């Protein structure tokens, strides 16, 4: 119930970029098993969208941390906020496939 | 800066988020075209719940046109009007 | 020893103001959510206010909502709960538990409960 | 707002007796956000059960809670004096976290 969405507006807007991207916890650190996360996830800026050649692929240039207080609970017997760094990107490119 | 507890929970928590959508997943039946761009933004159900018990899905759709450049490799192109489906709200809902 | 001690209750006219204190101690406050409960001479228990799982904001029974405001003191560790434009219905024993993650969504600690009471 | 309904509104029975209180849901609800609670005349509530089933930690074995769906249970199989008490159902996942009417507990002897 929107106007149409013009052809350039959408090639400039999906065209490779970090993106707001909400990104599981356990994903991110496999090796935990003593606790369970609350949230489960988290937003992390994170390259996304099209390149639009086969022979590119999106990918992140420049890196950053970024530090979230993350409820860290041991099910059934108690819970504390912790600090946890994750990866942010923070400048993207089209770049030449990993043959 | 630390992301406050509670500005984490909020952010990630269920809700309809700009999504980069690839079209050809969207539409699987386009295997002789190539689109451009190849993929799209839209509002779609994303983020986290309570617990395991529970999955994020949407309670209310709609639709979306976008100029799309409809491509058939090695013989022509034409902009196409394309028709996306978007995620107006989310809820939390037990696991199917 | 993990302990929710209340204060600031008492008598209140009607469209009064009270603030009631919820002092905890053998734990940080800021691990946990503060949910308020109230008891209704003779009557059963009703969900007064709290921090939500349901998208992590603070929703209030209706009768409260609009009049009703949550809040915390992390150095005082201490949740706070402010009453205004007190009413009849009001009267009530008022209750502060703690909500938890670890026995999900359950209250394992509470207040010993005051007594407010809304008379001319 | 889902509505939480207990049976009996208040029972009686004997020391030894198993007894069984029912919470029924006004809509389906899954079995991790139902927790039971045991008042005291003039005292603060305190937890029994928690998601359904699970015995909460000091409380004696008697207290057992089951259900799923609509129907959840608080089932005491040898009631005790001192269980006089209102037992009370809760459900904390969907907003607003609301409790039962409650179950009056009474001794005979």
């Known amino acids: 119930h929107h106007e149409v969405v013009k052809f350039m507006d959408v090639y400039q807007r999906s065209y490779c970029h970090p993106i707001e991207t909400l990104v599981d916890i356990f994903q991110e650190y496999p090796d935990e098993i003593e606790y369970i996360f609350k949230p489960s996830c988290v937003p992390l800026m994170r390259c996304g969208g099209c390149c639009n050649d086969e022979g590119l692929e999106c990918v992140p240039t420049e890196e950053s941390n970024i530090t979230m207080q993350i409820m860290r609970i041991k099910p059934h017997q108690g819970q504390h906020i912790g600090e946890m760094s994750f990866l942010q990107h923070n400048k993207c490119e089209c770049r030449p496939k990993k043959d | 800066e630390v992301v406050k507890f509670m500005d984490v929970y909020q952010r990630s928590y269920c809700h309809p988020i700009e999504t980069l959508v690839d079209i050809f997943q969207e539409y699987p039946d386009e295997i002789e075209y190539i689109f451009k761009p190849s993929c799209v933004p839209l509002m779609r159900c994303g983020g986290c719940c309570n617990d395991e018990g529970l999955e994020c899905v949407p309670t209310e759709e709609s639709n979306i046109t976008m100029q799309i450049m409809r491509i058939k490799p090695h013989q022509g192109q034409h902009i196409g009007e394309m028709s996306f489906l978007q995620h107006n709200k989310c809820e939390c809902r037990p696991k199917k | 020893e993990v302990q929710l001690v209340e204060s600031g209750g008492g008598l209140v006219q009607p469209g009064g103001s009270l603030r009631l204190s919820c002092a905890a101690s053998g734990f940080t406050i800021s691990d946990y959510w503060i949910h308020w409960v109230r008891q209704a001479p003779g009557k059963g228990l009703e969900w007064v206010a709290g921090?939500?799982?349901?998208?992590?904001?603070?929703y209030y029974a209706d009768s409260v909502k609009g009049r009703f405001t949550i809040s915390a003191d992390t150095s005082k560790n201490t949740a706070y709960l402010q009453m205004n434009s007190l009413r009849a219905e009001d009267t009530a024993v008022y209750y502060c538990?703690?909500?938890?993650?670890?026995?999900?969504?359950?209250?394992?600690?509470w207040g010993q409960g005051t007594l407010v009471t809304v008379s001319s | 707002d889902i509505q939480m309904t207990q049976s009996p509104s208040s029972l009686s029975a004997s020391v030894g007796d198993r007894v069984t209180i029912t919470c029924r849901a006004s809509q389906f609800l899954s079995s991790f956000g139902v927790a039971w609670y045991q008042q005291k005349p003039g005292k603060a509530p305190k937890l029994l059960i928690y998601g359904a089933s699970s015995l909460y930690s000091g409380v004696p074995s008697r207290f057992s809670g089951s259900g799923s769906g609509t129907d959840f249970t608080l089932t005491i199989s040898s009631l005790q004096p001192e269980d006089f008490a209102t037992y009370y159902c809760?459900?904390?996942?969907?907003?607003?976290?609301?409790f039962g009417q409650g179950t009056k507990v009474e001794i005979k002897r």
């Open positions: 809760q459900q904390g996942l969907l907003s607003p976290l609301t």
């Open positions: 538990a703690r909500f938890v993650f670890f026995l999900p969504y359950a209250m394992d600690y």
């Open positions: 921090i939500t799982p349901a998208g992590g904001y603070t």
